[PDB]
C-alpha cells in the first residue's frame, strides 16, 4: 500500500502543478486572443514506412518478451537444452532481421 | 577562471546527496537501529511474521535474544 501511497502522492503533486500552470494565471486580465503550419488544406499523407517500422518494433518487442526469462532460467538443471533454445531463439531474431533487411524494409527509412 | 562553475556542482551534489542519507537515516530510525528487513521470498516473510508474533509487541525490530528462553 506504500507503493500506491507514493503513486497517489506523485499524481496529486502533478495535478497541483498542472492546476498552477492552468488556472493560477487566469487571475490576470491580459487579453483575449482571437488569432484569425505548412499544412494548407491537404490530407495527412500515409507514410507507410513509419507504420512498417512500428509493427516491426511490435514483433521484435514481442519476441524480446519471449527472450526475457533467461536470468531466472539460468539456474535450471538441464543447461544444454536451455543453451540450445536461447541460441536458436537469438538466431531466429537474426534471421528475421536478415529478412527485414533483404525485402526492401530498410530502405528510404534506413 | 575554471573554479567558478563548481558552486553549482556542489549544489547538485548536496541535492543528490540529501535523499539517500535521509532515507538511510529514516530506515535506521524506523527499524529500531537496524536495516529494513527485506522480503524477496515468502520464507523471509514467514520469518518476519514469526518475529512479529514471537516479540510480544507486534514490532519485529524489538528482537528477543537468548535471554527470552530458560
Amino acid at each position: 500500500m506504500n507503493l500506491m501511497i507514493t503513486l497517489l502522492t506523485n499524481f496529486t503533486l502533478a495535478t497541483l502543478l498542472v492546476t498552477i500552470a492552468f488556472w493560477l494565471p487566469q487571475l490576470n486580465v491580459y487579453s483575449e486572443k482571437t488569432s484569425p503550419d505548412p499544412m494548407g488544406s491537404a490530407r495527412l499523407p500515409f507514410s507507410m514506412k513509419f507504420f512498417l517500422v512500428a509493427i516491426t518494433f511490435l514483433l521484435f518487442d514481442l519476441e524480446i518478451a519471449l527472450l526475457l526469462p533467461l536470468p531466472w532460467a539460468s539456474q535450471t538443471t538441464n543447461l544444454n537444452t536451455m543453451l540450445t533454445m536461447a541460441l536458436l531463439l537469438i538466431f531466429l531474431l537474426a534471421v528475421s532481421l536478415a529478412y527485414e533487411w533483404t525485402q526492401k524494409g530498410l530502405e528510404w527509412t534506413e | 577562471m575554471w573554479f567558478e562553475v563548481l558552486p553549482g556542482i556542489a549544489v547538485m551534489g548536496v541535492c543528490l546527496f540529501i535523499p539517500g542519507m535521509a532515507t538511510a537515516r529514516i530506515h535506521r530510525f524506523s527499524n529500531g537501529g537496524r536495516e529494513k528487513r527485506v522480503a524477496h521470498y515468502s520464507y523471509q516473510w514467514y520469518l518476519m511474521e514469526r518475529d512479529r508474533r514471537v516479540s510480544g509487541v507486534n514490532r519485529y525490530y524489538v528482537s528477543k535474544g537468548l535471554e527470552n528462553i530458560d
Partner: protein, 169 residues
C-alpha cells in the same frame, strides 16, 4: 472496504471496459482501455504475480497499444446519443449487479456466483527461497521445447506476412 480491493479494482475494470464499450472514437476508446489495462494489471499484481503484471505493463500497454495509437494516428482526422444511451445502460446493469452482490452476496446468471470477499482462497504456505511464478516462467527454456519452437516459427512467419501482404504488389 480495503479487504475487497481486488474486487473494487475488478469493478473499475468493468467500468474501464464500459469506457470503450460504446466506442465513440478510437482514440478515446484507446485511452479508456489503457486505463482498464492498468487496473487489470493492478488486479494481477495484488495476487502476487509481479512478473505477469509487468508483462502486462511492458508488452500489452507500453509496447503494443503504443503501436495501436500509432496506427490510429494515421487515420481518424481531428475535428453520440446512442453511445450515451448504451453508457447509461451499462452503468445501470453494472450498478444493479453491484447491489445484487452487495446485498444478496449470491447471484445466478449462468452458474451460482458468490458475493463474499475473495480474501478466503489465498494460501498460507511458503514456496521457500523462490517465487513460484518466477521459476514457473523460467521453466520455459528447460521443458517448453515444442512451444518455443512453434512460437518462434509463428513470429517469423508473421514477419513474412508483414513483408508480403503489405508490399502491395
Amino acid at each position: 472496504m480495503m479487504t475487497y480491493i481486488v474486487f473494487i479494482l475488478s469493478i473499475i475494470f468493468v467500468m474501464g471496459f464500459v469506457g470503450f464499450s460504446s466506442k465513440p472514437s478510437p482514440i478515446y476508446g484507446g485511452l479508456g482501455l489503457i486505463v482498464s489495462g492498468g487496473v487489470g494489471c493492478g488486479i494481477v499484481l495484488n495476487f502476487g504475480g509481479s512478473f505477469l503484471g509487468l508483462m502486462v505493463f511492458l508488452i500489452y500497454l507500453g509496447g503494443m497499444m503504443v503501436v495501436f495509437g500509432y496506427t490510429t494516428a494515421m487515420a481518424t482526422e481531428q475535428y453520440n446519443k446512442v453511445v450515451l444511451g448504451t453508457f447509461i445502460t451499462g452503468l445501470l446493469m453494472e450498478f444493479l449487479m453491484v447491489y445484487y452482490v452487495l446485498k444478496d452476496k449470491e447471484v445466478e446468471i449462468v452458474f451460482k456466483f458468490n458475493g463474499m470477499g475473495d480474501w478466503v482462497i489465498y494460501d498460507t504456505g511458503d514456496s521457500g527461497f523462490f517465487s513460484e511464478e518466477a521459476m514457473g516462467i523460467a521453466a520455459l527454456y528447460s521443458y517448453g521445447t515444442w512451444l518455443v519452437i512453434v512460437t518462434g516459427w509463428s513470429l517469423l512467419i508473421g514477419v513474412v506476412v508483414i513483408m508480403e501482404i503489405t508490399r502491395g504488389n
